[PDB]
Nucleic acid binder design. Structure first.
Lengths: 179, 179
DNA sequence: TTAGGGTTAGGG
DNA sequence: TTAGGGTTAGGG
Protein backbone atom coordinates (compact mmCIF):
# COMPACT_ATOMS: atom_id res chain seq x y z
CA UNK A 1 0.00 0.00 0.00
CA UNK A 2 1.24 3.54 -0.80
CA UNK A 3 2.00 5.91 2.04
CA UNK A 4 -0.75 8.30 3.14
CA UNK A 5 0.46 11.28 1.14
CA UNK A 6 -0.57 9.52 -2.09
CA UNK A 7 -4.00 8.61 -0.64
CA UNK A 8 -4.74 12.11 0.64
CA UNK A 9 -7.01 14.84 -0.72
CA UNK A 10 -6.90 18.53 0.10
CA UNK A 11 -10.51 19.72 0.44
CA UNK A 12 -10.67 23.43 -0.43
CA UNK A 13 -13.42 25.93 0.27
CA UNK A 14 -15.14 24.22 3.20
CA UNK A 15 -18.05 25.91 4.86
CA UNK A 16 -16.76 27.33 8.15
CA UNK A 17 -19.41 25.13 9.82
CA UNK A 18 -17.94 21.86 8.51
CA UNK A 19 -16.40 19.67 11.22
CA UNK A 20 -14.11 16.65 11.19
CA UNK A 21 -17.27 14.64 11.85
CA UNK A 22 -19.24 16.05 8.90
CA UNK A 23 -16.17 15.95 6.59
CA UNK A 24 -15.54 12.28 7.50
CA UNK A 25 -19.21 11.34 7.11
CA UNK A 26 -19.17 12.77 3.62
CA UNK A 27 -15.97 11.21 2.26
CA UNK A 28 -16.64 7.83 3.88
CA UNK A 29 -19.17 7.19 1.18
CA UNK A 30 -16.16 6.17 -0.99
CA UNK A 31 -14.29 4.10 1.60
CA UNK A 32 -12.56 3.97 4.94
CA UNK A 33 -10.58 7.05 5.99
CA UNK A 34 -7.29 6.63 7.86
CA UNK A 35 -7.15 10.38 8.58
CA UNK A 36 -9.50 13.33 8.44
CA UNK A 37 -8.84 16.88 9.67
CA UNK A 38 -10.43 20.34 9.37
CA UNK A 39 -7.69 22.93 9.73
CA UNK A 40 -8.37 25.62 12.30
CA UNK A 41 -6.87 28.77 13.69
CA UNK A 42 -5.02 27.58 16.82
CA UNK A 43 -6.05 30.68 18.83
CA UNK A 44 -9.75 31.06 17.97
CA UNK A 45 -10.44 27.47 16.79
CA UNK A 46 -12.27 28.95 13.81
CA UNK A 47 -12.16 26.90 10.61
CA UNK A 48 -9.60 27.98 8.01
CA UNK A 49 -11.95 26.71 5.31
CA UNK A 50 -10.07 23.61 4.23
CA UNK A 51 -9.04 20.24 5.43
CA UNK A 52 -7.75 16.83 4.41
CA UNK A 53 -9.07 13.29 4.05
CA UNK A 54 -6.89 10.21 3.60
CA UNK A 55 -8.42 7.04 2.14
CA UNK A 56 -7.31 3.48 2.84
CA UNK A 57 -6.40 2.84 -0.84
CA UNK A 58 -5.61 4.64 -4.08
CA UNK A 59 -8.73 3.15 -5.66
CA UNK A 60 -10.91 4.88 -3.07
CA UNK A 61 -9.31 8.28 -3.79
CA UNK A 62 -9.98 7.85 -7.51
CA UNK A 63 -13.57 6.87 -6.88
CA UNK A 64 -14.15 9.99 -4.79
CA UNK A 65 -12.64 12.22 -7.47
CA UNK A 66 -14.65 10.45 -10.17
CA UNK A 67 -17.82 11.47 -8.26
CA UNK A 68 -17.24 15.24 -8.33
CA UNK A 69 -18.81 17.74 -7.79
CA UNK A 70 -18.76 17.48 -3.99
CA UNK A 71 -21.09 19.50 -1.81
CA UNK A 72 -20.66 19.40 1.97
CA UNK A 73 -22.78 21.30 4.46
CA UNK A 74 -24.33 23.32 1.63
CA UNK A 75 -21.17 24.50 -0.16
CA UNK A 76 -19.47 23.10 -3.25
CA UNK A 77 -15.92 22.26 -2.25
CA UNK A 78 -12.83 21.69 -4.42
CA UNK A 79 -11.02 18.39 -3.71
CA UNK A 80 -7.45 18.10 -4.97
CA UNK A 81 -4.68 15.52 -4.76
CA UNK A 82 -2.58 16.69 -1.82
CA UNK A 83 0.58 18.56 -2.75
CA UNK A 84 3.36 17.54 -0.36
CA UNK A 85 4.59 20.03 2.20
CA UNK A 86 8.12 19.70 0.77
CA UNK A 87 6.87 21.42 -2.45
CA UNK A 88 6.10 24.61 -0.55
CA UNK A 89 7.78 27.59 -2.08
CA UNK A 90 8.14 26.10 -5.53
CA UNK A 91 6.47 28.08 -8.37
CA UNK A 92 3.08 26.67 -9.16
CA UNK A 93 3.08 24.16 -6.29
CA UNK A 94 -0.55 24.92 -5.42
CA UNK A 95 -1.84 26.18 -8.78
CA UNK A 96 -4.63 24.12 -10.29
CA UNK A 97 -4.25 23.77 -14.04
CA UNK A 98 -5.36 21.47 -16.81
CA UNK A 99 -2.07 21.55 -18.75
CA UNK A 100 1.06 19.41 -18.51
CA UNK A 101 4.61 20.03 -19.81
CA UNK A 102 6.36 16.95 -21.19
CA UNK A 103 10.14 17.06 -21.66
CA UNK A 104 12.83 14.71 -22.97
CA UNK A 105 10.80 13.51 -25.99
CA UNK A 106 13.47 14.56 -28.55
CA UNK A 107 12.67 14.83 -32.29
CA UNK A 108 10.86 11.55 -33.00
CA UNK A 109 7.88 12.02 -30.67
CA UNK A 110 4.70 13.18 -32.37
CA UNK A 111 1.35 14.32 -31.07
CA UNK A 112 -0.18 10.86 -31.27
CA UNK A 113 2.60 9.40 -29.12
CA UNK A 114 1.70 11.75 -26.29
CA UNK A 115 -2.01 11.01 -26.84
CA UNK A 116 -1.48 7.24 -26.74
CA UNK A 117 0.46 7.56 -23.51
CA UNK A 118 -1.69 10.06 -21.60
CA UNK A 119 -5.22 9.28 -22.75
CA UNK A 120 -5.63 6.61 -20.08
CA UNK A 121 -5.29 9.31 -17.43
CA UNK A 122 -8.22 11.36 -18.62
CA UNK A 123 -9.88 13.18 -21.47
CA UNK A 124 -7.41 15.16 -23.57
CA UNK A 125 -8.54 18.39 -25.16
CA UNK A 126 -5.39 19.33 -27.07
CA UNK A 127 -1.75 18.40 -27.57
CA UNK A 128 1.04 20.73 -28.72
CA UNK A 129 4.46 19.48 -29.90
CA UNK A 130 6.78 22.49 -29.82
CA UNK A 131 8.88 23.23 -32.93
CA UNK A 132 11.32 26.01 -33.85
CA UNK A 133 9.51 28.49 -36.10
CA UNK A 134 12.61 29.13 -38.22
CA UNK A 135 14.29 25.74 -38.53
CA UNK A 136 11.06 23.71 -38.29
CA UNK A 137 12.75 21.17 -36.04
CA UNK A 138 11.05 19.67 -33.04
CA UNK A 139 12.45 21.22 -29.85
CA UNK A 140 12.00 18.08 -27.71
CA UNK A 141 9.05 18.98 -25.55
CA UNK A 142 5.30 19.48 -25.70
CA UNK A 143 2.15 20.12 -23.76
CA UNK A 144 -0.94 18.08 -23.03
CA UNK A 145 -4.16 19.87 -22.03
CA UNK A 146 -6.83 17.85 -20.30
CA UNK A 147 -10.46 18.71 -19.70
CA UNK A 148 -9.92 18.62 -15.93
CA UNK A 149 -7.09 19.40 -13.49
CA UNK A 150 -7.17 16.04 -11.71
CA UNK A 151 -5.27 14.06 -14.39
CA UNK A 152 -2.44 16.66 -14.23
CA UNK A 153 -2.39 16.46 -10.46
CA UNK A 154 -2.16 12.68 -10.49
CA UNK A 155 0.39 12.51 -13.31
CA UNK A 156 2.89 14.90 -11.66
CA UNK A 157 3.09 12.74 -8.59
CA UNK A 158 5.33 10.62 -10.84
CA UNK A 159 8.06 12.84 -12.32
CA UNK A 160 9.57 10.36 -14.82
CA UNK A 161 7.59 8.50 -17.51
CA UNK A 162 8.65 6.16 -20.34
CA UNK A 163 7.23 7.69 -23.54
CA UNK A 164 8.01 6.66 -27.12
CA UNK A 165 11.27 5.01 -26.16
CA UNK A 166 12.42 7.95 -24.02
CA UNK A 167 13.01 8.69 -20.38
CA UNK A 168 10.60 11.63 -20.32
CA UNK A 169 9.81 14.06 -17.54
CA UNK A 170 6.46 15.73 -16.68
CA UNK A 171 5.85 19.09 -15.05
CA UNK A 172 2.75 21.05 -14.27
CA UNK A 173 2.49 23.70 -17.05
CA UNK A 174 3.15 27.25 -15.90
CA UNK A 175 2.52 30.50 -17.75
CA UNK A 176 5.35 33.03 -18.31
CA UNK A 177 4.05 35.05 -15.38
CA UNK A 178 4.33 31.99 -13.09
CA UNK A 179 7.85 30.92 -14.22
CA UNK B 1 26.35 55.24 -10.28
CA UNK B 2 24.22 52.17 -9.64
CA UNK B 3 25.16 48.78 -11.10
CA UNK B 4 23.72 48.04 -14.53
CA UNK B 5 21.05 45.75 -13.11
CA UNK B 6 19.28 48.80 -11.64
CA UNK B 7 19.54 50.74 -14.92
CA UNK B 8 18.22 47.89 -17.07
CA UNK B 9 14.83 47.26 -18.68
CA UNK B 10 13.46 43.95 -19.87
CA UNK B 11 11.63 44.58 -23.16
CA UNK B 12 8.90 41.98 -23.66
CA UNK B 13 6.98 41.19 -26.82
CA UNK B 14 9.47 42.41 -29.44
CA UNK B 15 8.64 42.06 -33.08
CA UNK B 16 10.69 39.14 -34.38
CA UNK B 17 12.19 41.63 -36.85
CA UNK B 18 13.57 43.92 -34.14
CA UNK B 19 17.35 43.98 -34.04
CA UNK B 20 19.87 45.29 -31.57
CA UNK B 21 20.21 48.26 -33.91
CA UNK B 22 16.50 49.11 -34.04
CA UNK B 23 15.98 48.48 -30.29
CA UNK B 24 18.91 50.80 -29.52
CA UNK B 25 17.68 53.48 -31.91
CA UNK B 26 14.33 53.49 -30.14
CA UNK B 27 15.46 53.59 -26.50
CA UNK B 28 18.26 56.11 -27.10
CA UNK B 29 15.52 58.70 -27.31
CA UNK B 30 15.80 58.79 -23.51
CA UNK B 31 19.58 58.60 -22.98
CA UNK B 32 22.73 56.83 -23.99
CA UNK B 33 22.67 53.05 -23.63
CA UNK B 34 25.51 51.20 -21.93
CA UNK B 35 24.04 47.86 -23.15
CA UNK B 36 21.43 46.60 -25.66
CA UNK B 37 20.65 43.04 -26.68
CA UNK B 38 17.95 41.06 -28.50
CA UNK B 39 17.80 37.54 -27.15
CA UNK B 40 17.89 34.69 -29.70
CA UNK B 41 17.72 30.90 -29.84
CA UNK B 42 21.33 29.58 -29.80
CA UNK B 43 20.68 26.99 -32.53
CA UNK B 44 18.42 28.71 -35.06
CA UNK B 45 19.15 32.41 -34.18
CA UNK B 46 15.43 33.13 -34.22
CA UNK B 47 14.46 36.08 -32.03
CA UNK B 48 12.89 34.96 -28.77
CA UNK B 49 10.74 38.06 -28.77
CA UNK B 50 12.47 39.98 -25.96
CA UNK B 51 15.63 41.83 -25.10
CA UNK B 52 17.22 44.25 -22.68
CA UNK B 53 18.39 47.84 -22.73
CA UNK B 54 20.56 49.44 -20.07
CA UNK B 55 20.69 53.18 -19.63
CA UNK B 56 23.52 55.35 -18.32
CA UNK B 57 21.51 56.39 -15.24
CA UNK B 58 18.44 55.55 -13.24
CA UNK B 59 16.87 58.89 -14.20
CA UNK B 60 16.98 57.87 -17.86
CA UNK B 61 15.17 54.59 -17.06
CA UNK B 62 12.49 56.56 -15.27
CA UNK B 63 12.12 58.91 -18.21
CA UNK B 64 11.65 56.04 -20.64
CA UNK B 65 9.04 54.44 -18.39
CA UNK B 66 7.20 57.75 -18.02
CA UNK B 67 6.86 57.82 -21.84
CA UNK B 68 4.96 54.54 -22.30
CA UNK B 69 3.35 53.08 -24.34
CA UNK B 70 6.33 52.05 -26.46
CA UNK B 71 5.89 50.77 -29.99
CA UNK B 72 8.92 49.36 -31.81
CA UNK B 73 9.06 48.09 -35.40
CA UNK B 74 5.27 48.19 -35.44
CA UNK B 75 4.50 46.20 -32.27
CA UNK B 76 3.55 47.57 -28.85
CA UNK B 77 6.11 46.20 -26.38
CA UNK B 78 6.09 45.79 -22.58
CA UNK B 79 9.13 47.34 -20.84
CA UNK B 80 9.75 46.24 -17.27
CA UNK B 81 12.40 46.89 -14.64
CA UNK B 82 14.74 43.95 -14.95
CA UNK B 83 14.39 41.14 -12.43
CA UNK B 84 17.77 39.68 -11.50
CA UNK B 85 18.77 36.22 -12.66
CA UNK B 86 19.18 35.20 -9.02
CA UNK B 87 15.42 35.53 -8.49
CA UNK B 88 14.70 32.75 -10.98
CA UNK B 89 12.82 29.91 -9.34
CA UNK B 90 11.09 32.08 -6.73
CA UNK B 91 7.31 32.26 -6.90
CA UNK B 92 6.23 35.47 -8.58
CA UNK B 93 9.73 36.45 -9.70
CA UNK B 94 8.47 37.51 -13.11
CA UNK B 95 4.90 38.43 -12.26
CA UNK B 96 3.73 41.89 -13.36
CA UNK B 97 1.19 43.28 -10.89
CA UNK B 98 -0.13 46.59 -9.63
CA UNK B 99 -0.35 45.44 -6.00
CA UNK B 100 2.28 45.45 -3.30
CA UNK B 101 2.40 43.44 -0.07
CA UNK B 102 3.88 45.36 2.90
CA UNK B 103 4.84 43.30 5.95
CA UNK B 104 6.30 44.10 9.33
CA UNK B 105 4.17 47.17 10.01
CA UNK B 106 2.73 45.85 13.33
CA UNK B 107 -0.44 47.27 14.89
CA UNK B 108 0.16 51.02 14.83
CA UNK B 109 0.56 51.50 11.07
CA UNK B 110 -2.46 53.05 9.34
CA UNK B 111 -3.44 53.69 5.72
CA UNK B 112 -2.05 57.20 5.76
CA UNK B 113 1.40 55.99 6.82
CA UNK B 114 1.55 53.79 3.74
CA UNK B 115 0.11 56.54 1.53
CA UNK B 116 2.64 59.08 2.79
CA UNK B 117 5.55 56.66 2.22
CA UNK B 118 4.58 55.18 -1.14
CA UNK B 119 2.84 58.03 -2.95
CA UNK B 120 6.20 59.33 -4.17
CA UNK B 121 6.68 56.19 -6.23
CA UNK B 122 3.51 56.52 -8.28
CA UNK B 123 -0.23 57.02 -8.25
CA UNK B 124 -2.02 54.99 -5.62
CA UNK B 125 -5.40 53.39 -6.32
CA UNK B 126 -6.20 51.77 -2.96
CA UNK B 127 -4.59 50.93 0.35
CA UNK B 128 -5.68 48.10 2.64
CA UNK B 129 -4.50 47.56 6.20
CA UNK B 130 -5.37 43.93 6.98
CA UNK B 131 -7.26 43.09 10.19
CA UNK B 132 -8.61 39.92 11.76
CA UNK B 133 -12.24 39.73 10.62
CA UNK B 134 -13.65 38.67 14.00
CA UNK B 135 -11.50 40.71 16.42
CA UNK B 136 -10.68 43.77 14.28
CA UNK B 137 -7.09 43.57 15.44
CA UNK B 138 -4.44 44.67 12.95
CA UNK B 139 -2.50 41.70 11.59
CA UNK B 140 0.70 43.60 10.80
CA UNK B 141 0.59 43.78 7.01
CA UNK B 142 -1.27 45.52 4.22
CA UNK B 143 -1.48 46.06 0.51
CA UNK B 144 -0.88 49.06 -1.72
CA UNK B 145 -2.43 48.96 -5.19
CA UNK B 146 -1.03 51.41 -7.74
CA UNK B 147 -2.53 52.38 -11.08
CA UNK B 148 0.44 50.80 -12.89
CA UNK B 149 2.92 47.94 -12.35
CA UNK B 150 6.08 50.00 -12.64
CA UNK B 151 5.99 51.56 -9.12
CA UNK B 152 5.71 48.04 -7.68
CA UNK B 153 8.63 46.81 -9.79
CA UNK B 154 10.81 49.73 -8.69
CA UNK B 155 9.83 49.42 -5.00
CA UNK B 156 10.66 45.71 -4.72
CA UNK B 157 14.17 46.30 -6.00
CA UNK B 158 14.71 47.34 -2.31
CA UNK B 159 13.39 44.56 -0.03
CA UNK B 160 13.53 46.47 3.27
CA UNK B 161 11.88 49.84 3.85
CA UNK B 162 11.51 51.89 7.02
CA UNK B 163 7.81 52.66 7.46
CA UNK B 164 6.20 54.35 10.48
CA UNK B 165 9.36 53.57 12.39
CA UNK B 166 9.32 49.85 11.55
CA UNK B 167 11.70 47.70 9.54
CA UNK B 168 9.14 46.69 6.90
CA UNK B 169 9.41 44.31 3.97
CA UNK B 170 7.87 44.67 0.49
CA UNK B 171 6.85 41.88 -1.90
CA UNK B 172 4.94 41.78 -5.19
CA UNK B 173 1.44 40.66 -4.29
CA UNK B 174 0.56 37.06 -5.22
CA UNK B 175 -2.71 35.20 -5.13
CA UNK B 176 -2.87 32.49 -2.50
CA UNK B 177 -2.84 29.83 -5.23
CA UNK B 178 0.60 31.06 -6.33
CA UNK B 179 2.05 30.69 -2.80
C1' DT C 1 20.31 19.84 -22.35
C1' DT C 2 13.80 18.93 -21.32
C1' DA C 3 9.58 26.08 -20.87
C1' DG C 4 5.19 27.38 -25.70
C1' DG C 5 2.21 30.37 -27.01
C1' DG C 6 2.57 36.26 -31.47
C1' DT C 7 2.61 35.55 -24.02
C1' DT C 8 7.49 38.53 -22.59
C1' DA C 9 13.36 36.40 -18.18
C1' DG C 10 19.81 37.16 -19.90
C1' DG C 11 24.18 37.17 -24.11
C1' DG C 12 28.25 38.68 -23.50
C1' DT D 1 6.48 36.06 13.64
C1' DT D 2 5.39 39.77 8.06
C1' DA D 3 -0.01 36.51 2.79
C1' DG D 4 -6.06 39.20 2.00
C1' DG D 5 -10.00 38.23 -0.14
C1' DG D 6 -16.37 33.43 1.39
C1' DT D 7 -10.35 33.05 -2.02
C1' DT D 8 -8.80 26.83 -0.90
C1' DA D 9 -1.95 24.37 1.45
C1' DG D 10 -1.03 20.52 6.89
C1' DG D 11 -2.12 19.14 12.54
C1' DG D 12 -1.73 15.04 14.33
Amino acid sequence: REKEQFRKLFIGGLSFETTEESLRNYYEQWGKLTDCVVMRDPASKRSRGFGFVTFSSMAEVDAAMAARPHSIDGRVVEPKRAVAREESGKPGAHVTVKKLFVGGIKEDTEEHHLRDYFEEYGKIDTIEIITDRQSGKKRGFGFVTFDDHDPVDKIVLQKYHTINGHNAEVRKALSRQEM
